[PDB]
Amino acid sequence: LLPTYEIAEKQKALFLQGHLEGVDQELEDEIAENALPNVMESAFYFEQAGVGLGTDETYRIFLALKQLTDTHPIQRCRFWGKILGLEMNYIVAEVEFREGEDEEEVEEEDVAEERDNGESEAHEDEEDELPKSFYKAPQAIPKEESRTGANKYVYFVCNEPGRPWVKLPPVIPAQIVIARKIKKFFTGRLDAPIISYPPFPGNESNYLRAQIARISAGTHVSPLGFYQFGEEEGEEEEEAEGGRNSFEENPDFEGIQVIDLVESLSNWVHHVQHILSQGRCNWFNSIQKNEEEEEEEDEEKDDSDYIEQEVGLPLLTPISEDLEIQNIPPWTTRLSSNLIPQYAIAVLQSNLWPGAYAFSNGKKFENFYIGWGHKYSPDNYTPPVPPPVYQEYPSGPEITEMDDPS
Amino acid sequence: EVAPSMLEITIQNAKAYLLKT
Amino acid sequence: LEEEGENDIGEYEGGRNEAGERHGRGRARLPNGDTYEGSYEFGKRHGQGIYKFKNGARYIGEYVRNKKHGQGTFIYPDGSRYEGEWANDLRHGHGVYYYINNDTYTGEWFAHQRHGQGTYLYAETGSKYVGTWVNGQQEGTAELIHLNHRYQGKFLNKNPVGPGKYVFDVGCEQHGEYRLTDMERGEEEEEEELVTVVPKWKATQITELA
């Protein structure tokens, strides 16, 4: 009894058409129209690019997205890519859900916040009181809301085609900061803890979500003019602090020539919002206190508690302005075949994230990460230094023992 | 006990292979 | 505050010797608002006692001639505390400091400073710096141990230096070196330009556990 047969009996669930003898054709018409990506055409174009999986694995994920789209009410889907691992790889799909059908997690924070105010009552001993610590811990950077920022794109991950897909947990700004500060493999199991320095507040599923978001924020690129900002009428006075977080596909996209897409880096524009060093896509002020508390602290505000607003790159940025990795261009452009300029397609290679590739035949494009999910660095990944030891309470008169009078 | 020679080990391996059914 | 008012004695409840000085176990309220409860000798503190300061600071331990001595626990008003030996109102010997954010330092002490061998555990991360301490700065051969790994090598001014190796629990070691690299020129306000010495790891070989 071989594991070749175990996948074979698992994948035949994909290959076999379901026994839908009694399911309405109108319901089948409403389902099988707009919920699917052209993974198969993408892999051929990435086969033109010199990357991508083989056919048989691509058609198996092409099957796996059918059962995924049939089980869940998916509005739009795209094959995000494949992140390899120690025991098994991860097959990742980037999707968008329908309105009003989201499985909202019903307030898991309501339980965690009610386990610290355990006041002890009815104990009368009014001597030897402990000096209470004035250390207010720095505020944890709040998670981004659904359909916004790094949490805008929902990701499902399956180990193999024919296996059930599993929902990735949403990503945390503390997770992204630590995921940048660490560098670990994936073990093929999402329940494996990330045992690293600094410690990751989550399992491998949270680290996979953080790595995918970091790849998406810096590799997902589109041809210039493919995507355009929506023309919202009436919001001309609210552009001071909030950037444009929405984009739409341009119906008038005639198309950039492949030779222009290769010779010029500026014809490729990113289509996913950048993740800040705070760990968000939109900056949050951790010092913004309540208005009822600000009215009494306006006379002793020091100049050491200001946090500079982390402003990242906006939407639709050319890849030529991405940071050069020690005079190395962050993106590699080449033709799919140098002997033919007419049916060259614009092979784009992410030097910042090895394994991330984007094609363009002139009109169609996709982004596709097949790697290990790790950021390229010219030097070593240096583990962080131990934090500096906090300075002890100074030995002033309140620690110097007052002398004994006669 | 003297360790068996490589010639003797190959002889035992050859005898056992011919004893395979 | 150690300049005694020789005429301002303050309140005292306890025994006295033949010369009128305070002797034996007694409780004294000093004029600075501080309180003491412990044994006395010739009008001076000796033996076990508790000195509670005005702002919330408090020492529990032994005293020798108006000076803290022996084993003692001082709980500072910021919520931090120290438990260990004392000598002439100074942190001395082996002792444990619990910091303001549950950080735990355990090791030797010398003149209110971290000295000798010491283990500093960061509460937020869980990493422990085990090694030699010189004037409260990371120095000498030391181990930064965190979870599944430990770096074994040298430190200098909280910036680890020189050759070293990382030992992981999976069965491997990574031999390399730390190079003190000075590329961060702070554009901050013009106050005491701090050379932010950034140590960079440069590995040379990877070995198994022998």
Place this chain on the structure above:
Amino acid sequence: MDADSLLLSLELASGSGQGLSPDRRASLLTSLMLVKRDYRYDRVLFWGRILGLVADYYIAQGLSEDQLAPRKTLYSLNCTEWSLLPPATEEMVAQSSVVKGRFMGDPSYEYEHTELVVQIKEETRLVSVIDQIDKAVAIIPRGALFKTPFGPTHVNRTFEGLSLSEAKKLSSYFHFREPVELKNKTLLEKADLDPSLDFMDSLEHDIPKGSWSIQMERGNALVVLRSLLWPGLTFYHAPRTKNYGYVYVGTGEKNMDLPFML
């Protein structure tokens, strides 16, 4: 990764996603058998692809009658024009060890390093990177080669492929080079090994431990061994057949963060 079954090798090693274009695939298929006659090689192995910033180095090697003999390295920039490469020495590696980063893609490009200014070519860097990968993460299954008592090592014509149990074990895969740790092995360990089959160093004792991520693509009908010391390396094995081979598609940089990574 034989040239005769290069198309099958590329289709099976495409599970790592780092395939090749049909332009480069058919150019490789034709050019390896051209290099095979032009230098009179017994067998030709496609080494893989070293990615660059402008062009990609396509590397392949040729072998003599002795399978353990030093092989001859050739490289290309468009899978058509193949140029030979010089062998590496100790001074060759010691110079090239100080260069870090990705390859530019131009063989005449030169890297400058300050020693306490040494000029180090990219073709100089390419040769050492190829030889460092060849000495470290080369894989051959057990029983693929047999060593005659006369000294030369030949391809075992009776090799039917590894079994299903042996394909899941790291000890059944051996380094495709001369033994190093086998000489340091004791006589008691030498008594249990076949001199004609176990004459190489096994991947079980590879330094560091856990450097191989062995995986079951299509359920161990294809056995995929991905190197963790060198990212982008994928070795495919099909049990009960003669299909085997390894391909490196990457930047040619060692993962010396591997203790940090595991």
